[PDB]
Design a protein around this ligand. Sequence first.
Ligand SMILES: Cc1ncc(-c2nc3c(OC4(C)CC4)nc(Nc4cnn(C5CC6(C5)CN(C)C6)c4)nc3cc2F)cn1
Length: 267
Amino acid sequence: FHSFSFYELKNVTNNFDERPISGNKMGEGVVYKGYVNNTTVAVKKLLKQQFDQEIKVMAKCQHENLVELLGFSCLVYVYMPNGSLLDRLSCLDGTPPLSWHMRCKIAQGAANGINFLHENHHIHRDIKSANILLDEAFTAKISDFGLARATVMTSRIVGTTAYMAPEALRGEITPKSDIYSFGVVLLEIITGLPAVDEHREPQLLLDIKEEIEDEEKTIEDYIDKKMNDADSTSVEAMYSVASQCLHEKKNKRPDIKKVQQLLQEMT
Ligand SMILES: Cc1ncc(-c2nc3c(OC4(C)CC4)nc(Nc4cnn(C5CC6(C5)CN(C)C6)c4)nc3cc2F)cn1
């Protein structure tokens, strides 16, 4: 890695411009746009124990479906031209909707990323569409390794509530919890709906699974209307994977290698 100095990064961010574009701030520590020679970068100005793991994971783990850390002193990353899956799903700033075909590539790539992490004996602990970033070609790249962990329990429960497995909300640290979170992500990819919306009924997206099972509604009734290329067969095939992931009994969920397999078979 490139061992940076806090003054260089200030000028690249132009005195750390905490403002939109109409500045440098892209969103949120905080993340601002920048440049190093020609290389566009996202700098994360940040807890100390979290920074140690972020560098540990980024040094051990290198994959095309994971983000790349360039510098540290303030973690520095290759700017992602298409932001997060969350923002692209909600068409933030007027970006056009993702087609079914693009969404499949995203799901597939994100599973590959998780498989690489599970292969290298690591648990993400915070899989969510905001942590799935997209490059110039919309390749999915898993991000945020600060709370990552190399069955085990903790008294300090952390993550994003709407994405968390039941046993994860009880304290458990299992790689099977990441699988549950990925199933919520697959539901957002199908529906284009955020995992949680206070001004919505149901507020929680993982509740639609129950409505479908109790035949109150169909998966067809929940498919994102902001697409023209989705076919019932492959949509039902992604929902089936999502359903399997979202089993309340952690040992009844598929492993990431099988999730990865079911996504390939779909295309
Ligand atoms: C621990 C950790 N922290 C942060 C990263 C990380 N984060 C981001 C990142 O984070 C955010 C989503 C909050 C802003 N954003 C981006 N790029 C981007 C952000 N917004 N946009 C839009 C998309 C357009 C501009 C509109 N359309 C015309 C192009 C692009 N790259 C990133 C790269 C990274 F490595 C990784 N690991």
